[PDB]
Design a protein around this motif. Structure first.
Motif, PDB file in Angstrom:
ATOM      1  N   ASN A   7      18.871  58.682  45.447  1.00 22.13           N
ATOM      2  CA  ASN A   7      19.394  57.478  46.248  1.00 22.13           C
ATOM      3  C   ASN A   7      20.244  56.387  45.513  1.00 22.13           C
ATOM      4  O   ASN A   7      21.001  55.815  46.195  1.00 22.13           O
ATOM      5  N   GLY A   8      20.012  56.233  44.288  1.00 27.52           N
ATOM      6  CA  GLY A   8      21.025  55.928  43.030  1.00 27.52           C
ATOM      7  C   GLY A   8      22.484  56.511  43.354  1.00 27.52           C
ATOM      8  O   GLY A   8      23.379  55.898  43.631  1.00 27.52           O
ATOM      9  N   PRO A  15      32.797  52.682  44.296  1.00 29.60           N
ATOM     10  CA  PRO A  15      33.907  52.027  43.715  1.00 29.60           C
ATOM     11  C   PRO A  15      35.143  52.463  43.160  1.00 29.60           C
ATOM     12  O   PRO A  15      36.084  52.083  42.937  1.00 29.60           O
TER      13      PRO A  15
ATOM     14  N   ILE C   5      37.698  51.981  38.460  1.00 24.29           N
ATOM     15  CA  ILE C   5      37.600  52.826  39.901  1.00 24.29           C
ATOM     16  C   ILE C   5      37.357  54.340  39.743  1.00 24.29           C
ATOM     17  O   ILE C   5      37.036  54.826  40.713  1.00 24.29           O
ATOM     18  N   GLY C   6      38.085  54.823  38.565  1.00 19.35           N
ATOM     19  CA  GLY C   6      37.514  56.216  37.799  1.00 19.35           C
ATOM     20  C   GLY C   6      36.338  55.783  36.630  1.00 19.35           C
ATOM     21  O   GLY C   6      35.531  56.533  36.146  1.00 19.35           O
ATOM     22  N   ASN C   7      36.526  54.728  35.882  1.00 19.68           N
ATOM     23  CA  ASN C   7      35.516  53.755  35.264  1.00 19.68           C
ATOM     24  C   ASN C   7      34.666  53.001  36.276  1.00 19.68           C
ATOM     25  O   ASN C   7      33.410  52.842  36.255  1.00 19.68           O
ATOM     26  N   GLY C   8      35.195  52.723  37.649  1.00 15.81           N
ATOM     27  CA  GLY C   8      34.609  52.646  38.940  1.00 15.81           C
ATOM     28  C   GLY C   8      33.582  53.640  39.459  1.00 15.81           C
ATOM     29  O   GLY C   8      32.437  53.409  39.520  1.00 15.81           O
ATOM     30  N   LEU C   9      34.150  54.968  39.844  1.00 16.37           N
ATOM     31  CA  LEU C   9      33.262  56.144  40.100  1.00 16.37           C
ATOM     32  C   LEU C   9      32.082  56.149  38.973  1.00 16.37           C
ATOM     33  O   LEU C   9      30.999  56.019  39.034  1.00 16.37           O
ATOM     34  N   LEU C  10      32.486  55.973  37.539  1.00 15.61           N
ATOM     35  CA  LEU C  10      31.796  56.273  36.478  1.00 15.61           C
ATOM     36  C   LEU C  10      30.593  55.215  36.333  1.00 15.61           C
ATOM     37  O   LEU C  10      29.508  55.518  36.145  1.00 15.61           O
ATOM     38  N   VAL C  12      28.952  53.149  38.664  1.00 11.95           N
ATOM     39  CA  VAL C  12      27.819  53.006  39.617  1.00 11.95           C
ATOM     40  C   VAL C  12      27.701  53.875  40.545  1.00 11.95           C
ATOM     41  O   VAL C  12      27.275  53.753  41.566  1.00 11.95           O
ATOM     42  N   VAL C  13      27.693  55.478  40.133  1.00  7.68           N
ATOM     43  CA  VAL C  13      27.029  56.389  40.890  1.00  7.68           C
ATOM     44  C   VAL C  13      25.609  55.949  40.977  1.00  7.68           C
ATOM     45  O   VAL C  13      24.648  56.683  41.226  1.00  7.68           O
ATOM     46  N   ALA C  14      25.112  54.627  40.603  1.00  7.73           N
ATOM     47  CA  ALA C  14      23.685  54.143  40.201  1.00  7.73           C
ATOM     48  C   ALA C  14      22.662  54.256  41.560  1.00  7.73           C
ATOM     49  O   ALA C  14      21.538  54.900  41.143  1.00  7.73           O
ATOM     50  N   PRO C  15      23.186  53.704  42.832  1.00  8.53           N
ATOM     51  CA  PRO C  15      22.147  53.329  43.859  1.00  8.53           C
ATOM     52  C   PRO C  15      21.620  54.483  44.848  1.00  8.53           C
ATOM     53  O   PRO C  15      20.475  54.096  45.326  1.00  8.53           O
TER      54      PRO C  15
END
Lengths: 23, 49, 23
Positions: A7-8, A15, C5-10, C12-15
């Motif tokens: 859910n991360g 983004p 925005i690829g360092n975006g992607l990178l 915060v895959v986080a939540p």
């Protein structure tokens, strides 16, 4: 013990929008 | 014989076609940019570039 | 012209942590 690093993963795939449009 | 003025109405239809490209991404090289397995050493950032 | 925005992607895959545990 169940909430938000898959859910991360899950919410903020956010983004990333270009995945550019250009070759 | 004489003649009348003639009109007409035409209707041209649209078309749909989508050209698409796709570009792949690596698997091994997935951390350097990232920081999941990025490490505070100095070589990881070089490989990151 | 290179950053996040690829360092975006990178980052915060986080939540995303559940990817639930239940069938």
């Amino acid at each position: 013990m169940s909430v938000q690093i898959g859910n991360g993963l899950l919410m903020v795939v956010a983004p990333g929008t270009l995945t550019v449009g250009s070759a | 014989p004489a003649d009348q003025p003639v009109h007409n109405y035409m209707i041209k239809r649209l078309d749909r076609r989508s050209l698409n490209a796709a570009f792949s991404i690596a698997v091994e090289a997935l951390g350097l940019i990232s920081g999941e397995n990025l490490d505070g050493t100095h070589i990881s950032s070089a490989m990151r570039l």
